[model samples]
Every structure is written in structure tokens, then in C-alpha cells.
Target: GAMDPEFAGGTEGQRLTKVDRSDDIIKPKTVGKEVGKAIEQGRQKFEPTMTQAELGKEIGETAATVASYERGTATPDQNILSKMERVLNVKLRGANIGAPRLGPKKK
Candidate 1:
């Protein structure tokens, strides 16, 4: 369902016929410029000795995801965000689901 935008009309239409065709568009609000800032700030408050790969593994995500978050190219979903916060022991504040909260990464 989330990948609808990437498959609106193509030869693979057979697989998406049952999907809701409503025009309830959901666009990305933030460009993730501030996610890196938040993640960097949060990192300073945690164990500064840990590598991104180590942290990513601890968060149950790939190192590229961590790097992308750090570089502000992408964000994390709620599931990944919660896991990351729990693993890193950081309080992400922006961009929460169902609430206007702020935090790191955009997914």
C-alpha cells in the first residue's frame, strides 16, 4: 500500500487492483535537513564511542539506514524509530505518528 506511488500505473497493475484507489494523497512534509541535527545532538548525549554500524545493528536496521538518517536523506518509520530510540536511549521529539511531535529521520 505504501508503495502505491511507485506503481500507480504499469505492467504490474494486476497486483494492485484490490488496493484502495482513493486520492487520499500523503506527501512528505519535511526534507530531513534537521534529522541529522537531531540525531547528531542525540548521539552526543549517548555513548559517543559507538560507531554508526554498531548503533544501526543494535536498532535492528541496516548501517545504510543509520547513515541515511545521519545525512538526512531519509527518515525512519514509527517501528524503526521506536526501536532506535530504545536502543540508543535517546528521546526523539519531531515527526511522530498521530501526533505533531518532532524527532530524527524521515521515512
Candidate 2:
């Protein structure tokens, strides 16, 4: 379960390897756009407003990248999302229910 934090826990049937994909990475145009939303959402989750430059500096990305992702002009990588989820305390990878995140990435 610990092999990948994304699937740290769950039945093995849900593994990507089971479906002939060794890597659990997938690219989608919509998600690239949603990535912008997710980044904004994560920023808003923090106290005091977190600027794009702030996030970019913290995550070793250019401030422009942050803005682009928010505008869907750029795509945030899974590792980037994972790092964001850790720092922002939200799930930005592989799910779009918008319910709990609708609530908050972390309580």
C-alpha cells in the first residue's frame, strides 16, 4: 500500500499495474485546466491569501507556471500535485468528486 502514496491504502485490484499500465500517470486536457482550479483551491485553503509567486517559490516552480496552470495554459505534474497536496493539504490527483474537497482537502 505504501508503494505509492496516491494509493497508500485500498484493495490491490485498483492498481494501475493490474491494467497493464506500470505508471499511474495520465494526461487530460480538462485536468490540465482543472489543475489551475485545484491550485487556486489549495491556495485559498490556507490562511491569509497565498499568492502564485509564493507557491511557485515554495515549490521551486516559476510564478508564471502557477498562473498558467490556473489559466489552463500549463499542466501541473502528478509530482507537483502530490507536493501541493502535502503542502496545501488537499488531493489534486486522480479524483473529481468535488464533494469532500468541496468540504476541504484537509480538515
Candidate 3:
């Protein structure tokens, strides 16, 4: 409890060094924007009445997360995708669908 900053250091070169390892770092990969469209199609076609928030509850996810899924900003794992497909009763992955050509979300 009585230590001082001057006595904290040991060796002269005992300091942190910055390394240029950009190439070695893993990127935040995504499943691709196509998957997003596929998911949206399954949801919209199967149950147009079910909003993203309602679907999110059934899928054990938040509304915002579900929005991100449709936006293709977040990636869905195989397990979650399986759940969504089951709930929607349609094929999601590789369904080759496109994002909805519409205006911004309603305020």
C-alpha cells in the first residue's frame, strides 16, 4: 500500500510495444447480404402479420437484432437460422431472395 511509481518499473525496456499485425487479425465476417433477404422473404411470405418484434420473440431474439438480421448487418448462426426456418416453415439459406425495394422504416 506504500509503493511508489518510481519503484514500480524493473528493467529499462519493460514497456509495452505496438505491433503491426493488421494482416493477422481476424475480420468481422458476415454471412452475406443475400442471406438477409432470404430471411426477410421467409418471414414476410409465411406470415405477413408477424412483425419483426413478434418474430423476434418467437425466435428468442430482440427486435433490434432481428432488424439487423434483415439489414444484413449481423450474422445468424446455423442453430438460430434453423429455428427461424422452422418457425417460418420455409427455406431461408440459399433461397436467393433480394431485399425489399421500399422506402425507410415508418416513423
lDDT of 2 by residue, 1-107 (tens): 45644535555555454445477757664446556676787686777877888887887888887777677557657665555556755555458521235334353
On residues 1-107, what C-alpha lDDT tens digit does candidate 3 reach at each position? 69655545455666787978554434456745767766676687764466788878988888987788878667756556556656655554333233222212212
Report the lDDT tens digits of candidate 1 across residue range 1-107.
35544435545444534566665445554425665665655554565555568768887778787777767555556556565555545555545422324333333
At residue 100, candidate 1 shows an lDDT of 24
Best by lDDT: 2
TM-score-wise, the better of 2 and 3 is 2
lDDT of 1: 0.57
Error of 3 at 20 (Å): 44
Least well predicted 10-residue stretch by lDDT in candidate 2: 97-106
Score every model by TM-score: 0.49, 0.55, 0.54
RMSD of 2: 15.7
lDDT of each: 0.57, 0.64, 0.63
- Cα displacement (angstroms), candidate 2, residue 99, comes to 7.4
| Model 2 segments more than 4 A misplaced | 1-30, 93-107
